């Protein structure tokens, strides 16, 4: 299991514009297009991203290309963020995958707000961190996914995804 297979399980794959859990226009493997309510704005962002007239539809290869970009960008964002970098650097390879999963879903800004949990992870207080992470809007809104990520931080194994 790796970050790519993990996110592929969490986000799914859709080749036509769809609305995400928050109701925003998305395509491919969780590639947020826009928070704007306009499908037109979304198709526009889509075409700009792929470099062609897509007409709201992309191929598998195109979805995977976006996906490769998004993962790279998530990693690079964590590395540049003064709050996140130190946590990431302190973690083992599996747990790093868990942080990248949060960043990909909720952005740097979204995660950078889990201050207390981040401190706990840094300290390697796994159980405590698992409990603190669960006291979040994130967990209340996307409980199944949040549980998988949380288990991942708690155990340092891919058990929650071996299921799936």
User: How many other C-beta atoms are found inside a 10 Å radius of the C-beta of residue 83?
Assistant: 15
Q: One of 10, 11, 45, 62 is an active-site residue; which one?
A: 11
Q: DSSP assignment, residue 12? A: -
Helices 126-133 and 143-155 cross at an angle (nearest 10°) of 170
> Which two tokens mark 19?
């609305």
- Please state the separation of Cα 125 from the chain's center in Å: 23
Q: How many whole angstroms separate alpha carbon 67 and alpha carbon 74?
A: 11
Task: Please state, as a whole number, how many other Cβ atoms lie within 10 Å of the Cβ of residue 97.
Answer: 22
Is 118 labelled a binding residue? Answer: no
How many other CB atoms sit within 10 Å of the CB of residue 38?
11
Of the listed 20, 64, 128, 159, which one is catalytic? 20
117 is in an annotated binding site: yes
DSSP letter for 158, please: S
Label residue 115 exposed, middle or buried (CB < 10 Å: 0-12, 13-18, 19+): exposed
90 is in an annotated binding site: no
Resolution (A): 1.8
Tokens representing residue 151 in the block: 């288990």
Q: Closest by alpha carbon to 72, among 26, 33, 103? A: 103
Looking at the structure, give the CATH architecture of the domain made up of residues 1-164.
Answer: Orthogonal Bundle (1.10)
**Domain residue limits, the chain:** 1-164
Tell me the C-alpha distance between 119 and 36, whole Å. 34
Q: Which residues of 118-139 are buried (b: 16+ CB within 10 A; e: fewer)?
A: bebbeeeebebbbebbeebebe
Which of 33, 29, 28, 24 lies closest to 11 in space, CA to CA? 29
Q: CA nearest 134: which of 122, 124, 120?
A: 120
Token output for 90: 């302190």
Whether residue 39 is annotated as binding a ligand: the answer is: no
Distance, C-alpha 122 to centroid of its chain: 20
Please state how this structure was obtained. Answer: X-ray
| Strand residues in 45-93 grouped as ranges (E) | none
Q: Can you tell me whether residue 133 is helix, strand or coil?
A: helix
- Give the C-alpha separation, 85 to 105, whole Å: 17
Long-range contact set of residues 131-137: C-beta below 8 Å, sequence gap at least 24: none
Annotated catalytic residue 11: yes
Please give the backbone phi and psi of residue 4, each rounded to the nearest 5 degrees, phi first: -65, -50
How far apart CA 98 and CA 106 sit, in angstroms, is 12
């Amino acid at each position: 299991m790796n970050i790519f297979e993990m996110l592929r399980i969490d986000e799914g794959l859709r080749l036509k514009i769809y609305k995400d859990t928050e109701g925003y226009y998305t395509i491919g493997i969780g590639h947020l297009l826009t928070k704007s309510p306009s499908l037109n704005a979304a198709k526009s962002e889509l075409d700009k991203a792929i470099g062609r007239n897509t007409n709201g539809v992309i191929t598998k290869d195109e979805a995977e290309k976006l996906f490769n970009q998004d993962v790279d960008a998530a990693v690079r964002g964590i590395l540049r963020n003064a709050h996140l970098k130190p946590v990431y650097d302190s973690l083992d390879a599996v747990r790093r995958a868990a942080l990248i999963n949060m960043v990909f879903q909720m952005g740097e800004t979204g995660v950078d707000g889990f201050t207390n949990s981040l401190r706990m992870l840094q300290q390697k207080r796994w159980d405590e961190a698992a409990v603190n992470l669960a006291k979040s809007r994130w967990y209340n809104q996307t409980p199944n996914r949040a549980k998988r990520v949380i288990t991942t931080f708690r155990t340092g194994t891919w058990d929650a995804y071996k299921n799936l």
